[model samples]
Target: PCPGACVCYNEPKVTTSCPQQGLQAVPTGIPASSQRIFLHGNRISHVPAASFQSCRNLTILWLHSNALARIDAAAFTGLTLLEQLDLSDNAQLHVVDPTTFHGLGHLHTLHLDRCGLRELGPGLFRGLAALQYLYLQDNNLQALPDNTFRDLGNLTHLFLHGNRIPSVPEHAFRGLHSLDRLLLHQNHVARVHPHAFRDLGRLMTLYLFANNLSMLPAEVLMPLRSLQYLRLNDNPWVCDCRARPLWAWLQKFRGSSSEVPCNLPQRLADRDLKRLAASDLEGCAVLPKCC
Candidate 1:
């Protein structure tokens, strides 16, 4: 018979659902052949080692919306074939290290949204080679260290919105050659290094709206040959002689429309960049070369 407060099914791959049962720990009596486990909406506080040691064949584990605060380094030691792990909506989960995800080599999706994360250590995401979608939005991250995502080469989508990220460092996105979309909107991004997007040549869409950006130098967009959709509105953009490159690039760009209205210089304020004529930029030209 199935364990108390748990629903078990053998058809379509054995699955055990023990959600909203107010359990304080991982339940027992789970069949060894179970492949899916749903433990969301629970009161489980910690995931210690051997918590799911018997579920080696489990492919999907849903533990979101719980009271999880701590995850031992070897908590997931036996889940080598696990593909997806949802630890989101755990308000008290603040500490995460590389070892916390030690055995999930085949994992592809990891959600850490609204976990109150403040920082990430070096090599924290080193082993997730097959990871494709990573959700780190709605956190308190102020900045990302260099090469923070160096191992996520196969990643396709990375969500860093709804945070406090202030800047994007150079080579910060290295090794992400297969990435397609990057979401960095709704943050405090005031500056982006010139070569930050050099490795993201395959990226098709980029979101940088609702940030503290005052400029988007042309060099930053030069490497994005596959870029089609770009959102740069809701930012304080300063248009002057230094913005010549961006203005020239926009005139010939064939991608989707963008609103880059000038936010500085009283005369150019509230003026649309694409409609501005060369005559309007009469004095904003290059000077003669000094011999």
Candidate 2:
């Protein structure tokens, strides 16, 4: 028999789904043969450490859009077969212990977007080696912790857009060796450390438009050897002798560095950066400080 008023089936597929059943907590008596459980859109407030200890065959779990406030350190302790888990839209899940997903080695996709997350502590993503896609966009994260994702070596896609991150410090993206797409757009970022994207060599698409960035020279982005698409528009860029380095780098870049309108240096105001001639920077000494 299934737990509470939940439904269970077999002939069609091995699935157990309970959604919006007014469940204040995860129900017990789940079948051991369960593969996919849909528990999203519920009133569940907390996830205990031993909720699904019997479902060894479960692979997919959806727990998004709930009144969740807390989840035990071992809430998903024995869910080794679980690959996809959705905890997005849990607005009150303010704190997440690093041990919450310790043994989830084979987990592939984890979604926690729009969860009102404030600060991500160190070791928060330690044991997730096989994790590929992680969604942490639209949260309240202010700063990125270094070495926090050292274990996610195989991760490919990371979404971190729509936040209030102030600056990008060096060693910020340490272990994302296989990352392909990173979204850091729409965030109010002022300064970015030159070595921030040093490890993102394989990253292809980068979106950093619509922010408070004033200056980012080509000297800072020499490590993205495999980059393709680049978007740096809608920023208040200051163009002058300081931009000599970027001006030289833009000529050799084949990817999209278009629509970079300068707002400063009144002589060249409203000028597109790509159109600036060598004569404009004729007397201007390049970045290394001319004698």
Candidate 3:
């Protein structure tokens, strides 16, 4: 029986375009010499072992916008030099092991958007130390493990948005001194550890928006003198009269920062934050809602 509507065809140039093909697993006879493989817009449930074992020279792998459950180890074990992998737009797929990409040393870009992934194994990128760009958005991640990114010495750009990360672990990015761009938005984060970015001396652009954060440690942001752009918007901040820290940070205005005004003045804390941005009439959102 063809599990999950899989269709394997043997030919000198095997080309499978199963977009919306109702597939549960990868079809057979994936061309080892295929220049491109498109498996988009499906309801795939599993990725069998050695599914792309023969595609040694596969350059671009597009497996986005699907219901992929999990990517088994050895899925791309033979693609020693494969680059540009797109695994985004899957809201159900979660979990990827370090062994799954054991031999992908030459990989440059990896994308995992809306995949319902919550955590990354500490050793997930142990071998791919040369990875330059990574995208992980719209998942259920709450926090990064202390050593989740200890081995990615060459990581330059990282994107983690639309997750449930309430706070960042101090050791999450302990050794990424070469990191330049970081994106962390749309989560339940309320506070950032003072040392959240302790060892990142080369950080340039940071995007911390659309989260549940209220207060940020000045000492934590003080080290990023190399920072260029900072985005902080869509968060319901209580605009208290004592909002000197936030006001002070905005006053520096070294780079571009979102102009989200806080609800102001202790006496008028009951009004919306928008009320303060215009006429400075409302109070801040200090207390928790429904608690």
Candidate 4:
């Protein structure tokens, strides 16, 4: 039985579509053989548990652009094969239940952006070991929970830009061994712990533009052996003795990078970080010591 006003097709992969409906809640009577379900662009506020319990074959679920504020536990029970789940653009969803994605082990792509999240629980991403692409940008997040994504070893792309995060916590990105692109731009990030990205050896592209970073040590990026694209423009950099390490690293670096501008040392104001000379840092005129 199909829900009211829904269109369910039986052939060529079973699908149920009730998008753009003025629904107040999740509609009942979803077919069990559904492989893909589209319930986006609705006014639905909450999803009850076991709502998709019978949809065992469901692989993709789209619930974005809704008025969703809550999702009961076990809402996706029996969905072992489910892979793609999107819950983006739900501005009213300020906080996600830690168990919201419990047992979703096969998920590869998960979207939770623009949900006004304040913080993530340490166990929020617990059973999602198969996850690869995670979308968590454009939120109100102030901090990242340690070991939150530790189990997601297969994760690749991590989008965390456009937030209120003040610092990158140690062990926050501990287990994403396959991460390729990490975007933390347009945030309040002022500091990054030494071990913040200790496990991202395979990470390729890193974006830290438009933040509060002053001087980032070169050693912090030594672990990113596959780095290709690096963008660090639009930050307030103080080109003092402390900045030489990163400056020398950029001088010898072979990857593509943006020209970092200096905001201090009046004589070198607006000078590019990569083009600075040893003479420019005269106040602490000491030979480069590989400390």
| Model 1 vs. true fold: TM | 0.93
- TM-score for all predictions? 0.93, 0.91, 0.79, 0.95
lDDT digits (tens) for residues 143-261 of candidate 3: 78787777677889888877888888778777787899998877777777788898777888888878776556566677777888887776655565334455555667577666554
| Per-residue lDDT of candidate 1, residues 80-135 (tens digit) | 99999999999788868666876578989999999888887777788788999999
lDDT of each: 0.84, 0.83, 0.71, 0.87
Which wins on lDDT, candidate 2 or candidate 4?
Answer: 4
Please report, as a residue range, the 10-residue window in candidate 4 with the lowest summed lDDT: 282-291
Clashes of 3: 9
Q: Using lDDT, give the best candidate's number.
A: 4
| Cα lDDT tens digits for candidate 2, 1-291 | 887888889745578889988888888777989888889989999999868878897888999999989989988978998999899999889778877888888899999898888878878888899999999999998988777778888999999988888878887788899999888888888878888888899988888887787678575678888888877788777776666677777878888765777877667777977688866754542244531
lDDT of 2 at 216: 81
Question: What lDDT would candidate 4 get against the real structure?
Answer: 0.87
Shift of residue 19 alpha carbon in model 2, Å: 1.6
Please report, as a residue range, the 10-residue window in candidate 1 with the lowest summed lDDT.
282-291
Q: Give the local distance difference test score of model 1.
A: 0.84
Off by over 4 Å in 4: 284-291
In order of TM-score, best first, we have: 4, 1, 2, 3
